[PDB]
Structures are given as C-alpha cells and as structure tokens.
C-alpha cells in the first residue's frame, strides 16, 4: 500500500514466486520499475493496485485477477498493467477492441418465457461507479458518504413501480437484517481474506445500505464492492420482465445522476469501469436458478455449458449465468442466457424419458 | 487510511457512536480537526493511526487501545492523541512521568528459584524497534527487508550460548513449522480480524522469520508485530536464569545494532517505542506457567492477583504475568513476578492441607 522511492525497485519489487493470479503473470521487475513512480491524480499508486494480489497468492485451479482500480484514472495511468490483464481475462479483448453497451430491453430477442417447473428464478445483477469519486478500495469516508447521499437522494426520487426505501446498515439488524437476509436483500461484509485484504471494508458499516422498491424486485447496494450494485431479480423465470425492470431502473437512476453532474463512468473501450478488471464492460450477470436433476449427470454437461458461454455455482438446481462481460453487450449477454437456458431445459426434459441428445458449437445460447 | 483535505472534518470524522476502545474515548471532532492535516516525515497521518480502531469496535468487557504508531515520530507528532491514551491505559502515566529501564540482570533481587512441582515454565518476552525504519503498520517491503537483513546479520554474529540460526517463513513448513510449532518457536500470521485490520500483514511472509540458538532457549521474531520480538523462555522455573539470558541477549543484540548505526528507539519518557501504545515502556512480559489447582478456586484469587499486580490467561495451570509496562523497570517488573508467584505457591500449598490464608495490599509481589 506504500513504497519509498528512496529504495531500489528490486528491493520494493514483491516476491511473487508462488502466485497464481493474473497480476502475478504480467507484473515484472521491468514493468514494476516503469510505473513504480507514476500516480493517479488521487494518489493511487501501483503498489496499491497490486497490493491485494501480492497478499492473496490465489489458488492453482481458480485463478483470481490480482488487482483493483482505485479510481477511473487508474486504468489510463496503469494502462501497461491492466491492458494485458484484461486481454488475458476476457478472451484476449485487445486495447483496440471496442465494446457494445445496449440497454434497450426491447432488443432482447424473444427470451419468451421459459419453463417455471424448471427455472426457480431469474435475476440480473450489475455494478456502477459514480464519477468524480474514487472507487471503494480508495475513497475516504468523506467521498463514501457523498456517494451514499447522492445515491439515496437519487433513488428516493424514483416513483412508479420503483418507489422504494433506503436502509443504512448501521441502523439495521434481523428485525430487517434476518428478514432482508432470509428474504435475500441486504449485504454482509466482504470479510473474505481476499476482500478485506483489498483494504475496502474500512469504516464498516458507515455510509453503506440497501435500497429497494416495496415489491423487493429491484435492490440496490450502496458503497459495497463498487459505488452501486443494482440487482433486479424476480421469482419464477420471466427473464424478459426481469431484464426489463433492470434496464429501466438503471435508465432512470443514471438520468438523475446525470442531471446532478455525476454520470456513471463508462468509456467506449472498457465500457463501464468498476473496481475489478474482471467485471469490466457491462459488469453484468444475467442468470437463473435452473433445476437440472439430470442434464448435470450427463458428462457432456460442461462442454454444453462451455459451447453456450455459461457458468454455474453450487446452490439439483444450479446458478447458470452468462460468461462474457467485455465485448458483448447487455442485451446480447442476457440473450445468451435465455436461449442457452432454453436448450438446457429442452434437453433436461428429453433426459426425463431416457432419450439421447444433440448440442452445438460454441458462440451461442 | 486516507483522507482528502478537500472535505470538511465533520464529513471525514469517523462514526465512533458504538465503540469501546481507548482511541474512541478521546478522539473528538475538536481533536480530529486539529491534527487531521498534520503528518509524520514518513507520511503517516491520524486517519492512519486511528483506522484500525475505527474498524474494530472492540468489545464492552475487554477494552482495546484503538491505534498504532507508524513510526517513532508518530508519538511526538500525534502527541495530543497518544498522551491521553497512554495516561488512560497505564495507571495515568503523565506526559511528565519518567520511566526506568534497568536491564542489569543482577538487580533482580533473589527471585531465588521457585517450586518446579508448581511452575511448569518461566519466560520473558519483549519487543524492539530498530530506528531509522518505519514500524510494521507502515514500513515498505523495502524497509521490512532491510530490517530483516540487519537483524539476521546482527544475530548471526552472536556466538557463545547465543549461537543460533535464522529461519525465513517462506522457506518453511512443518518439517520445521510443525516442529518449531509443537516445539513453540516460529510465528503465525496476525490473521485476527484486528491485526489484519491494522494493515500490517502485507506481503506475508516476505521478509519474516524466526531466529534461535540451538538450545531453543532464546527465540527472536523478525518483522512480526514490531521490528523484533525477542523471547527468552526455559522449562521448569528458573525465572532468574531466564531473565539473565534475556538481559544479556538484548545487551548484545543492541550493541551490534548500535555499532551499525541503528540503536533500538527509546526515549526517557516512553522508554522503548513500539507499534502499540499498550506495550510501551519496557514492552516486557515476565510470566510463568504456574499450576494452582486450588488457589484459583479461592474467591479472593482475583484480588490477590490484583494486589500483586499480575494477570493471567487460559492455558489447572495459568499464565500469570506482570501487569505493569510503563513507569516500572524491567528488573522491578520481573521482580513483581517472582515474589508474586512465590506467594501464589506458598498459598496454593497451604490450601493443600485445608488451611486458611493471608494476603496483603496492592503494589507488591
């Protein structure tokens, strides 16, 4: 987190000998030395952007990024360090490759309405950073508060079906915590020996809260991982309607933020900037809680997912979600989820009557 | 850990509403504002010294300090903040009160040799900061390494009964770890949601190791909590001989450090400076593993300890150790342990034959 130019780069250079994370793969004595004296206009330095990676040796299988931006300029300034990491974590997205950001919910081709008897629920999460303020791993309580004020104010104005309420984390607990908890709402502390190693859980829970309509269908976290972490989920599997309220909520949030002089920082190369290079672009996670009692058992499962450009986590229901973030647009992405999920179900079904199946090649569904 | 003078102190001022730690008790909007722009010659700022406290609300019963010095100057600079905390944590040690530092092992009055059938082992721990370098919660990998180099070099020279070997933490594990472990040697990571919240476990385990004679009777940790954490323990209960090897080892360590231009930072007011204001002075912990199967059961136990100026932890054997650090000297302190322990045993014994006991008033044994 610190470094003294009075020392020779070789001495300050970290001992990444046993590290398994992107930052480790590209950071070199040569590179270090180059930008070990450059700094963002808000004092952010490489030693800072690389510190969480140096502390977290990661793990052989699951590979972590290894760094975080402390402000919008961190990308331009430490370009020589982030660029390779991005084009190493995003299918080789090149320093030239553009980025499509399409938030028109209509362009969501069909994504009709899939089998409820198979999809427990669909949701769309995303992050946003209000510009003019530093990012979580570096903003002062000062900044952090302003972000919340602005954020809350902004939200409070929202009427219609987006009429909700703010809930500061300090003034909270089970009476709402547990509720909000077992009712999946509020957010806990990034306690992870990775997130707290990021140095961004400082002054918890000051200036942090959950906001949400009365319908509890559109939640928004303030100052957690990034300035804003809007989430639009619904029960069942109306991925279409979900991704609708999503695009519109954002459309409106931003409009307020814009008229106040604080638009969400985005640039046509990276798209939307956030703390983690691996959530850059649309920073979107469209997903559903499918119930594939059998499709999973099938050994070609993985590849099917792979060829569909999807992921999943432990939850026989799974959390299949879109895999791309950079290069692909929001709509395209959510799309890759509906089509992909529909095939998962059509299959799962055919598996229900001991029948064989047929898939396809990557870059679809 | 950061702060922008562009913000009004009221906005950057932490929300200590629900905090139980010294820093919380004395930090006020008035004080904050005063030194919220002062900084040590190594860039350490209040926001830094208070950050670990703001993050750790502590606990109602056990009260924690709430801050740490990042360099020797942190005490002079943030004097208005540390002074009350020290004279609030050390029986009111005033900004004027001197401090005795007596390392002559001879002055240890008697402390003859106590009952082995009652004292499992005696040990003397202490900390030391090499001057010219910042303290653990702020030194760069650069500095940290220099400290180890110097430290190791220094140690390696030591011959006689102080002939030992260094053991960097990276090149380690059970083959020695476990050994060194079950054989109480090496040191683990301050993983505590308090120490790691101090921001001083960075780049672990780079530049950190255990050093010790072949007799494993004098251990020294490099760059753990403070620059050096020398420990002199022995089995049985020869507190005298223990506190001997202790004083001499230090006497010698320092002599090298001094001839190299890096004396242990000490000043006649605070004595020996270290990261935690609560270990200031002699930063000494003389203690023994007494076995008081009954003295403990006796309800006056606590007060007896109290009047003896002692403490203890869970280990029917206990870890009774000296309670004072500031004002009292090393010898006086170790003393308060032998005499105090001897009474604990003389009592425990009388308890063995269903007999009553007689104690005394504070300020002794």
XYZ file of C-alpha atoms in Angstrom:
730
model
C 0.000 0.000 0.000
C 3.087 2.216 0.330
C 6.576 2.442 -1.186
C 9.544 4.775 -0.833
C 11.299 5.961 -3.983
C 14.386 6.007 -1.748
C 14.583 2.284 -2.323
C 15.704 0.447 -5.437
C 12.813 -1.174 -7.364
C 14.459 -4.562 -6.851
C 14.082 -4.126 -3.115
C 10.447 -2.970 -3.284
C 9.553 -5.498 -6.005
C 7.241 -8.151 -4.457
C 8.161 -11.826 -4.130
C 5.537 -13.323 -6.432
C 7.436 -16.640 -6.713
C 4.423 -18.714 -5.620
C 1.490 -16.793 -7.014
C -1.442 -17.894 -9.156
C -3.310 -14.782 -10.286
C -3.287 -12.582 -13.378
C -1.381 -9.665 -11.826
C 1.341 -12.159 -10.962
C 1.626 -13.407 -14.544
C 2.264 -9.972 -16.053
C 3.954 -7.925 -13.295
C 7.704 -7.981 -13.902
C 10.750 -6.232 -12.473
C 10.906 -4.443 -15.790
C 7.278 -3.260 -15.683
C 7.252 -2.514 -11.956
C 10.233 -0.179 -12.317
C 8.491 1.625 -15.199
C 5.389 2.739 -13.315
C 6.605 2.386 -9.703
C 6.667 6.204 -9.547
C 3.552 7.095 -11.573
C 0.420 8.045 -9.604
C -3.252 8.847 -10.263
C -4.480 12.382 -9.514
C -5.938 10.963 -6.283
C -2.642 9.455 -5.102
C -3.325 5.876 -6.164
C -0.094 4.009 -6.965
C 0.764 0.589 -8.440
C 1.879 -0.658 -5.063
C -1.743 -0.016 -4.235
C -3.358 -1.618 -7.273
C -1.147 -4.679 -6.851
C -1.192 -4.997 -3.063
C -4.269 -7.236 -2.768
C -2.705 -9.627 -5.277
C 0.616 -9.744 -3.501
C -1.249 -10.654 -0.323
C -3.524 -13.225 -1.944
C -1.413 -15.983 -3.605
C -4.696 -17.171 -5.061
C -5.035 -20.851 -5.897
C -3.840 -23.278 -8.654
C -7.290 -24.068 -10.055
C -9.481 -20.967 -9.556
C -7.433 -18.010 -10.824
C -8.048 -14.515 -9.468
C -7.293 -11.178 -11.164
C -4.827 -9.778 -8.636
C -5.536 -6.061 -8.564
C -8.124 -3.315 -8.315
C -8.543 0.194 -9.684
C -8.767 2.935 -7.098
C -10.260 5.498 -9.446
C -11.211 5.950 -13.081
C -7.757 7.228 -13.952
C -6.132 4.047 -12.591
C -6.879 2.394 -15.909
C -5.418 5.089 -18.123
C -2.398 5.632 -15.855
C -1.530 1.987 -15.171
C -2.613 1.055 -18.702
C 0.551 -1.026 -19.287
C -0.526 -3.230 -16.367
C -4.269 -3.534 -16.732
C -4.383 -3.958 -20.508
C -2.655 -7.328 -20.568
C -4.656 -8.500 -17.572
C -7.920 -7.587 -19.316
C -6.833 -9.165 -22.622
C -5.925 -12.267 -20.621
C -9.099 -12.464 -18.591
C -11.586 -11.594 -21.326
C -10.824 -13.851 -24.281
C -7.999 -11.539 -25.304
C -10.005 -8.280 -25.528
C -7.430 -6.040 -27.265
C -6.516 -2.411 -26.318
C -8.239 -1.592 -29.582
C -11.369 -3.754 -29.346
C -14.500 -1.614 -28.838
C -17.422 -2.516 -26.586
C -21.168 -2.581 -27.124
C -23.450 -1.296 -24.381
C -27.108 -1.913 -25.343
C -29.625 -1.292 -22.587
C -32.739 -1.224 -24.709
C -34.747 -4.076 -23.134
C -36.696 -4.498 -26.337
C -33.710 -5.747 -28.348
C -33.869 -8.809 -26.081
C -34.873 -11.216 -28.810
C -37.791 -13.269 -27.607
C -36.381 -14.855 -24.494
C -40.101 -15.610 -24.473
C -40.891 -17.233 -21.148
C -39.216 -20.496 -20.122
C -40.340 -23.499 -18.054
C -41.181 -22.488 -14.439
C -41.290 -26.162 -13.497
C -37.557 -25.960 -14.262
C -36.418 -22.388 -13.550
C -36.843 -21.390 -9.904
C -35.943 -17.730 -10.555
C -34.142 -15.370 -12.909
C -32.052 -12.315 -11.960
C -29.804 -9.612 -13.430
C -27.047 -8.009 -11.335
C -24.661 -5.196 -12.374
C -22.306 -2.606 -10.951
C -21.905 1.156 -11.413
C -19.410 3.799 -10.326
C -20.468 7.414 -9.933
C -17.729 9.554 -11.495
C -15.942 12.348 -9.702
C -15.446 9.998 -6.753
C -12.716 7.399 -6.096
C -13.572 3.687 -6.007
C -14.223 1.577 -2.892
C -10.669 0.424 -2.425
C -9.601 4.071 -2.024
C -12.419 6.548 -1.301
C -12.410 8.431 2.007
C -15.277 8.309 4.463
C -15.817 11.769 3.043
C -16.317 10.551 -0.510
C -18.072 7.381 0.547
C -20.735 9.437 2.297
C -21.299 11.787 -0.648
C -21.783 8.766 -2.864
C -24.453 7.443 -0.496
C -26.145 10.826 -0.128
C -26.309 11.352 -3.881
C -27.261 7.700 -4.378
C -30.011 7.690 -1.762
C -31.349 11.073 -2.838
C -31.408 9.873 -6.421
C -33.177 6.646 -5.516
C -35.727 8.366 -3.238
C -36.971 10.415 -6.172
C -37.785 7.286 -8.179
C -41.570 6.856 -8.065
C -43.795 4.476 -10.026
C -43.035 0.788 -9.522
C -39.549 1.921 -8.480
C -40.846 3.554 -5.303
C -38.753 2.069 -2.526
C -36.832 2.837 0.658
C -33.233 3.108 1.885
C -31.840 1.074 4.759
C -28.486 2.164 6.233
C -26.518 -0.818 7.541
C -25.781 0.767 10.902
C -29.432 1.247 11.822
C -30.048 -2.378 10.971
C -30.418 -5.912 12.289
C -32.508 -9.111 11.956
C -35.824 -7.253 12.546
C -34.922 -6.380 8.977
C -31.434 -7.954 8.641
C -32.607 -11.542 9.108
C -35.764 -10.665 7.161
C -33.849 -8.851 4.432
C -31.454 -11.807 4.914
C -33.681 -14.898 4.566
C -35.526 -12.701 2.094
C -32.282 -12.082 0.204
C -31.820 -8.325 0.460
C -29.143 -6.507 2.492
C -25.412 -7.186 2.099
C -22.849 -8.548 4.542
C -19.176 -7.620 4.966
C -16.619 -8.705 2.307
C -14.950 -10.377 5.322
C -13.182 -12.711 2.873
C -9.404 -12.919 3.484
C -9.383 -11.501 -0.059
C -11.806 -8.567 0.051
C -10.661 -7.329 3.461
C -7.169 -7.786 2.001
C -8.280 -5.295 -0.670
C -8.484 -2.627 2.016
C -12.052 -1.624 1.201
C -14.153 -2.689 4.176
C -12.865 0.317 6.112
C -15.242 2.132 8.436
C -17.887 -0.578 8.096
C -20.766 -0.142 8.117
C -20.523 3.613 7.860
C -22.128 5.010 4.727
C -23.458 1.674 3.445
C -27.014 0.470 2.881
C -29.616 -1.488 0.882
C -32.336 0.264 -1.107
C -35.376 -1.332 -2.694
C -38.881 -0.955 -4.013
C -41.691 -2.246 -1.839
C -42.021 -5.179 -4.252
C -38.496 -6.278 -3.347
C -37.894 -6.883 -7.041
C -35.185 -4.273 -7.611
C -32.455 -3.977 -4.955
C -29.529 -1.566 -4.898
C -26.441 -1.770 -2.637
C -24.614 1.444 -1.879
C -20.839 1.517 -1.403
C -20.345 -2.249 -1.134
C -17.969 -3.652 -3.823
C -18.428 -0.636 -6.099
C -20.299 2.645 -5.745
C -23.589 0.946 -6.742
C -24.558 -2.684 -7.150
C -28.032 -2.760 -8.668
C -29.838 -6.118 -8.764
C -33.134 -6.977 -10.447
C -34.452 -10.413 -9.624
C -37.883 -11.987 -9.693
C -39.321 -15.385 -8.810
C -40.221 -17.966 -11.421
C -38.449 -17.320 -14.683
C -39.636 -14.289 -16.587
C -36.075 -13.357 -17.569
C -37.625 -10.927 -20.046
C -39.574 -8.867 -17.475
C -36.599 -9.131 -15.120
C -34.201 -7.672 -17.689
C -36.873 -5.037 -18.319
C -37.249 -3.505 -14.899
C -33.472 -3.785 -14.896
C -32.777 -1.656 -17.939
C -35.429 0.892 -16.966
C -34.342 1.207 -13.342
C -30.799 1.907 -14.499
C -32.014 4.179 -17.299
C -33.679 6.272 -14.575
C -31.028 6.049 -11.845
C -28.460 7.383 -14.291
C -30.707 10.151 -15.627
C -30.859 11.613 -12.113
C -27.153 11.107 -11.596
C -26.533 12.798 -14.901
C -28.645 15.874 -14.204
C -26.739 16.220 -10.943
C -23.364 16.252 -12.636
C -22.318 12.675 -11.864
C -22.798 10.242 -14.758
C -21.797 6.598 -14.364
C -18.191 6.453 -15.570
C -18.011 4.460 -18.799
C -15.725 4.778 -21.854
C -16.230 3.014 -25.193
C -13.166 0.795 -24.735
C -13.811 -0.694 -21.285
C -17.449 0.231 -21.214
C -18.388 0.608 -17.560
C -15.466 0.914 -15.193
C -15.521 -0.755 -11.774
C -13.061 -1.835 -9.103
C -12.353 -5.273 -10.575
C -10.964 -5.627 -14.118
C -12.886 -8.900 -14.354
C -16.312 -7.247 -14.066
C -15.500 -4.522 -16.548
C -17.600 -3.817 -19.626
C -21.256 -4.398 -18.748
C -20.350 -5.816 -15.353
C -23.486 -7.851 -15.872
C -24.517 -11.224 -14.535
C -27.701 -12.498 -16.068
C -28.599 -15.842 -14.568
C -31.282 -18.240 -13.426
C -31.777 -20.959 -10.799
C -32.463 -23.865 -13.140
C -33.286 -27.318 -11.803
C -31.445 -29.850 -13.975
C -31.746 -33.062 -11.964
C -30.248 -34.958 -14.902
C -28.650 -32.667 -17.509
C -25.953 -32.268 -14.874
C -25.342 -36.015 -14.588
C -24.682 -36.120 -18.341
C -20.865 -35.970 -18.870
C -21.085 -33.568 -21.844
C -22.699 -31.083 -19.427
C -19.574 -28.901 -19.048
C -18.920 -28.585 -22.773
C -22.613 -27.915 -23.389
C -22.313 -25.021 -20.945
C -18.981 -24.060 -22.499
C -20.367 -24.031 -26.029
C -23.254 -21.973 -24.626
C -20.872 -19.496 -22.976
C -22.254 -20.027 -19.497
C -21.165 -20.691 -15.918
C -22.685 -22.009 -12.679
C -22.163 -22.344 -8.911
C -23.220 -24.541 -6.016
C -26.737 -23.803 -4.783
C -30.132 -30.294 -8.147
C -30.661 -26.656 -9.089
C -27.807 -24.570 -10.482
C -26.940 -20.906 -10.967
C -26.247 -20.828 -14.710
C -25.165 -17.283 -15.656
C -23.647 -15.530 -18.693
C -19.868 -15.841 -19.030
C -18.971 -12.812 -21.123
C -18.645 -9.234 -19.835
C -16.337 -7.440 -22.279
C -17.040 -7.205 -25.994
C -20.613 -8.446 -25.611
C -23.470 -6.028 -24.868
C -26.029 -6.271 -22.056
C -28.828 -7.454 -24.334
C -26.631 -9.885 -26.243
C -25.497 -11.271 -22.908
C -28.899 -11.718 -21.280
C -29.826 -13.249 -24.641
C -27.025 -15.839 -24.475
C -28.753 -16.790 -21.227
C -32.361 -17.256 -22.312
C -31.526 -19.240 -25.457
C -28.852 -21.164 -23.595
C -31.170 -21.936 -20.695
C -34.000 -22.945 -23.011
C -31.737 -25.589 -24.549
C -30.713 -26.793 -21.087
C -34.378 -27.412 -20.317
C -35.382 -28.874 -23.697
C -32.531 -31.282 -23.018
C -33.205 -31.969 -19.341
C -36.703 -32.928 -20.498
C -35.550 -35.341 -23.222
C -33.397 -36.826 -20.476
C -36.577 -37.428 -18.449
C -37.669 -40.093 -20.945
C -34.337 -41.889 -21.346
C -33.613 -40.299 -24.743
C -30.329 -39.184 -26.352
C -29.469 -35.533 -27.041
C -27.855 -33.196 -29.582
C -25.980 -29.952 -28.918
C -23.880 -27.500 -30.943
C -20.689 -25.467 -31.209
C -19.547 -22.502 -29.026
C -20.591 -18.895 -29.559
C -24.317 -19.421 -28.904
C -27.050 -19.952 -26.337
C -6.100 5.025 5.792
C -6.676 8.058 3.552
C -8.445 11.427 3.760
C -8.865 14.419 1.469
C -8.392 17.893 2.923
C -10.980 18.889 0.309
C -13.580 17.588 2.712
C -14.820 19.179 5.916
C -13.546 17.417 9.074
C -17.152 16.710 10.051
C -17.551 14.652 6.906
C -14.282 12.730 7.353
C -14.769 12.370 11.125
C -15.496 8.672 11.888
C -18.772 7.420 13.355
C -17.494 6.104 16.680
C -21.014 6.032 18.194
C -20.751 2.356 19.193
C -17.097 1.942 20.039
C -15.377 0.510 23.103
C -11.660 1.262 22.827
C -9.339 3.963 24.135
C -8.951 5.842 20.838
C -12.732 6.123 20.779
C -12.882 7.652 24.259
C -10.505 10.520 23.475
C -10.894 11.194 19.727
C -13.267 14.128 19.287
C -14.426 16.325 16.421
C -12.423 19.047 18.096
C -9.211 16.996 18.306
C -9.622 15.334 14.911
C -9.868 18.719 13.192
C -6.707 19.881 14.994
C -4.346 17.217 13.674
C -6.325 15.974 10.642
C -3.723 17.726 8.459
C -0.511 17.039 10.412
C 1.733 14.230 9.119
C 4.902 12.378 10.160
C 8.011 12.773 7.981
C 7.154 9.355 6.510
C 3.604 10.333 5.522
C 1.814 8.741 8.466
C -1.438 10.564 9.283
C -4.034 10.351 12.080
C -6.514 8.743 9.742
C -3.871 6.057 9.658
C -3.148 5.794 13.374
C -6.874 5.686 14.106
C -8.037 3.480 11.236
C -7.643 0.109 12.983
C -9.720 1.428 15.882
C -12.461 2.758 13.664
C -12.676 -0.680 12.068
C -12.558 -2.618 15.330
C -15.473 -1.541 17.603
C -13.757 -3.627 20.251
C -15.904 -5.145 22.978
C -17.697 -3.970 26.191
C -15.605 -6.016 28.624
C -12.099 -6.368 27.125
C -11.055 -2.863 26.041
C -8.537 -2.380 23.237
C -6.260 0.623 22.627
C -7.559 1.662 19.210
C -4.494 2.869 17.347
C -0.909 2.205 16.340
C 2.185 4.289 15.674
C 3.598 4.035 12.182
C 6.992 5.444 13.085
C 8.870 6.931 16.015
C 7.698 10.424 15.149
C 4.036 9.346 15.338
C 4.219 9.819 19.085
C 5.709 13.295 19.054
C 3.506 14.460 16.165
C 0.193 12.994 17.341
C 1.160 13.683 20.960
C -2.253 15.243 21.734
C -3.835 11.890 20.837
C -1.470 9.313 22.251
C -0.726 11.053 25.548
C -4.227 10.717 26.956
C -4.488 7.159 25.681
C -1.234 6.226 27.433
C -2.219 8.017 30.661
C -5.514 6.130 30.476
C -4.065 2.721 29.757
C -1.103 2.844 32.132
C -2.439 3.901 35.524
C -2.428 7.518 34.389
C 1.252 7.757 33.340
C 1.561 11.546 32.883
C 3.263 13.386 29.946
C 5.817 14.304 32.577
C 6.315 10.964 34.344
C 9.768 9.496 33.592
C 10.497 5.814 33.007
C 13.076 3.439 34.433
C 14.792 0.971 32.121
C 17.033 -1.375 34.160
C 18.435 -4.326 32.253
C 21.093 -5.348 34.722
C 20.018 -8.940 35.492
C 21.835 -8.795 38.796
C 19.489 -6.207 40.320
C 16.863 -8.969 40.172
C 16.535 -9.344 43.914
C 16.721 -13.001 44.788
C 13.875 -14.419 42.769
C 15.809 -17.399 44.107
C 14.341 -20.493 42.499
C 10.674 -21.396 42.988
C 8.781 -24.701 43.216
C 9.125 -26.751 39.978
C 6.374 -29.056 41.213
C 4.234 -25.927 40.766
C 5.806 -23.831 37.991
C 5.857 -25.611 34.629
C 7.998 -22.913 32.967
C 9.064 -19.281 33.140
C 9.581 -16.886 30.208
C 10.364 -13.252 29.372
C 9.125 -11.683 26.122
C 9.783 -8.130 24.844
C 9.677 -6.020 21.711
C 12.173 -3.725 19.970
C 12.096 -1.313 17.043
C 15.239 -0.570 15.064
C 15.324 3.194 14.477
C 15.643 4.803 11.082
C 12.908 2.472 9.836
C 9.101 2.819 9.999
C 7.037 0.428 12.131
C 5.190 -2.685 10.916
C 1.900 -0.978 10.248
C 3.652 1.269 7.702
C 7.079 0.065 6.516
C 7.551 -0.814 2.842
C 8.740 -4.199 1.663
C 11.894 -2.196 1.095
C 12.278 -1.219 4.736
C 10.945 -4.505 6.028
C 13.709 -6.348 4.200
C 16.489 -4.068 5.460
C 15.254 -4.640 8.984
C 15.491 -8.404 8.467
C 18.897 -8.202 6.795
C 20.336 -6.063 9.578
C 18.529 -8.181 12.174
C 19.678 -11.517 10.775
C 23.219 -10.294 10.176
C 23.331 -8.984 13.719
C 22.005 -12.225 15.168
C 24.325 -14.427 13.065
C 27.341 -12.772 14.651
C 26.195 -13.740 18.149
C 28.377 -16.662 19.255
C 28.682 -18.294 22.676
C 25.457 -19.760 24.048
C 23.673 -17.336 21.711
C 24.869 -19.180 18.611
C 21.726 -19.891 16.632
C 20.176 -19.882 13.166
C 17.663 -17.882 11.113
C 14.573 -19.394 9.529
C 12.737 -17.313 6.901
C 9.000 -18.029 6.938
C 8.765 -18.563 3.195
C 11.291 -21.396 3.132
C 9.369 -23.075 5.912
C 6.794 -25.698 6.835
C 6.018 -28.491 9.348
C 9.374 -30.265 8.728
C 10.302 -27.313 10.906
C 6.966 -25.420 11.125
C 5.104 -28.178 12.968
C 8.314 -28.945 14.874
C 9.016 -25.288 15.613
C 5.225 -25.250 16.192
C 4.619 -28.079 18.695
C 8.021 -27.023 19.984
C 6.786 -23.442 20.345
C 9.055 -21.492 18.011
C 8.035 -19.843 14.718
C 5.182 -17.330 14.444
C 1.898 -17.473 12.549
C 0.003 -14.684 10.771
C -1.776 -11.973 12.839
C -4.830 -13.197 10.878
C -7.017 -11.741 13.646
C -9.828 -9.509 12.299
C -7.939 -6.935 14.389
C -4.297 -7.320 13.351
C -5.059 -7.757 9.650
C -7.324 -4.737 10.177
C -4.153 -2.921 11.281
C -2.830 -3.248 7.743
C 0.452 -4.850 8.776
C 0.338 -8.416 7.486
C 1.100 -7.136 3.991
C 3.359 -9.197 1.757
C 3.297 -12.146 4.156
C 5.509 -13.977 4.642
C 8.053 -11.906 2.779
C 10.901 -10.704 4.966
C 9.768 -12.519 8.123
C 11.426 -15.281 10.131
C 12.289 -16.960 13.453
C 15.834 -16.986 14.814
C 17.137 -19.023 17.723
C 20.066 -20.605 19.480
C 20.467 -24.348 19.138
C 19.242 -24.666 22.735
C 15.898 -23.187 21.691
C 16.019 -21.073 24.836
C 16.201 -17.640 23.207
C 13.917 -17.002 20.211
C 13.654 -13.844 18.128
C 10.883 -12.979 15.626
C 11.735 -10.592 12.829
C 9.159 -8.160 11.441
C 6.115 -9.723 13.112
C 4.240 -7.274 15.420
C 7.246 -4.964 15.759
C 10.703 -4.929 14.198
C 11.948 -7.505 16.751
C 10.144 -9.672 19.267
C 12.786 -11.337 21.419
C 11.649 -14.131 23.755
C 13.663 -15.951 26.412
C 11.913 -18.929 27.923
C 13.102 -22.042 29.698
C 11.443 -25.120 31.172
C 10.894 -25.568 34.885
C 11.005 -22.275 36.713
C 14.411 -20.669 36.930
C 12.953 -17.203 36.312
C 16.324 -15.828 37.404
C 18.408 -17.607 34.731
C 15.645 -16.898 32.214
C 15.736 -13.155 32.889
C 19.522 -13.459 32.672
C 19.974 -14.833 29.194
C 17.269 -12.312 28.375
C 19.082 -9.197 29.510
C 22.385 -10.386 28.043
C 20.958 -11.412 24.677
C 19.394 -7.974 24.328
C 22.513 -6.265 25.679
C 24.393 -7.910 22.793
C 21.778 -7.611 20.035
C 21.637 -3.872 20.635
C 25.415 -3.439 20.805
C 25.645 -4.738 17.233
C 22.697 -2.647 16.139
C 24.320 0.349 17.738
C 27.705 -0.064 16.072
C 25.849 -0.306 12.773
C 24.064 2.986 13.256
C 20.658 1.630 14.280
C 20.007 1.699 18.034
C 16.681 0.481 19.409
C 14.494 3.592 19.536
C 13.800 4.510 23.156
C 13.287 7.900 24.862
C 13.237 8.502 28.624
C 9.525 9.370 28.657
C 8.024 6.373 26.840
C 11.071 4.212 27.219
C 11.026 1.775 24.314
C 8.695 2.707 21.496
C 6.684 0.057 19.649
C 3.609 -0.149 17.446
C 1.100 -0.477 20.289
C 0.835 2.227 22.977
C -0.129 -0.534 25.408
C 3.233 -2.319 25.169
C 5.244 0.857 25.503
C 7.920 1.358 28.143
C 9.715 -1.954 28.681
C 7.249 -3.798 26.473
C 8.033 -6.680 28.782
C 6.005 -9.702 29.771
C 7.615 -11.718 32.501
C 5.477 -14.720 33.311
C 5.280 -18.342 34.359
C 3.026 -21.370 33.824
C 2.038 -21.965 37.439
C -0.184 -24.878 38.419
C -2.631 -23.610 41.051
C -5.203 -26.405 41.226
C -6.779 -24.670 44.222
C -5.562 -21.078 44.688
C -7.747 -20.405 41.663
C -10.858 -21.886 43.280
C -10.410 -19.466 46.190
C -12.704 -16.429 45.560
C -10.108 -13.866 46.727
C -7.909 -15.128 43.865
C -8.547 -12.109 41.593
C -7.806 -9.510 44.257
C -4.726 -11.462 45.340
C -3.516 -11.199 41.747
C -4.655 -7.577 41.633
C -2.812 -6.649 44.815
C 0.192 -8.463 43.323
C -0.070 -6.508 40.061
C -0.415 -9.589 37.896
C -2.521 -11.048 35.090
C -3.267 -14.468 33.574
C -4.812 -16.272 30.585
C -6.396 -19.594 29.698
C -3.857 -22.379 29.211
C -5.305 -26.012 36.259
C -2.156 -24.173 35.208
C -2.228 -20.444 34.484
C -0.105 -17.856 32.694
C 0.447 -15.331 35.490
C 2.463 -12.402 34.080
C 3.464 -8.888 35.200
C 0.823 -6.198 34.671
C 2.891 -3.026 34.508
C 4.861 -1.807 31.474
C 5.214 1.964 31.893
C 6.796 3.566 34.940
C 8.198 0.268 36.208
C 11.604 -1.003 35.048
C 12.413 -4.418 33.568
C 14.022 -5.724 36.750
C 11.343 -4.299 39.026
C 8.764 -5.936 36.792
C 10.291 -9.407 36.590
C 10.690 -8.980 40.352
C 6.968 -8.315 40.887
C 6.615 -11.713 39.221
C 8.961 -13.887 41.267
C 7.816 -12.549 44.647
C 4.213 -12.569 43.492
C 4.468 -16.110 42.162
C 6.229 -17.334 45.291
C 3.262 -16.162 47.365
C 0.851 -17.860 44.958
C 2.652 -21.137 45.606
C 3.155 -20.722 49.367
C -0.604 -20.211 49.378
C -1.579 -22.973 46.956
C 0.365 -25.263 49.295
C -1.400 -24.128 52.484
C -4.575 -24.780 50.516
C -3.406 -28.381 50.019
C -3.916 -29.065 53.734
C -7.287 -27.351 54.164
C -5.782 -24.280 55.865
C -6.767 -20.588 55.725
C -4.595 -17.903 54.108
C -3.373 -14.313 54.492
C -2.508 -11.827 51.743
C -1.661 -8.118 51.526
C -2.282 -4.779 49.837
C -1.515 -3.754 46.202
C 1.849 -2.509 44.969
C 3.786 -5.725 45.676
C 4.570 -9.267 44.591
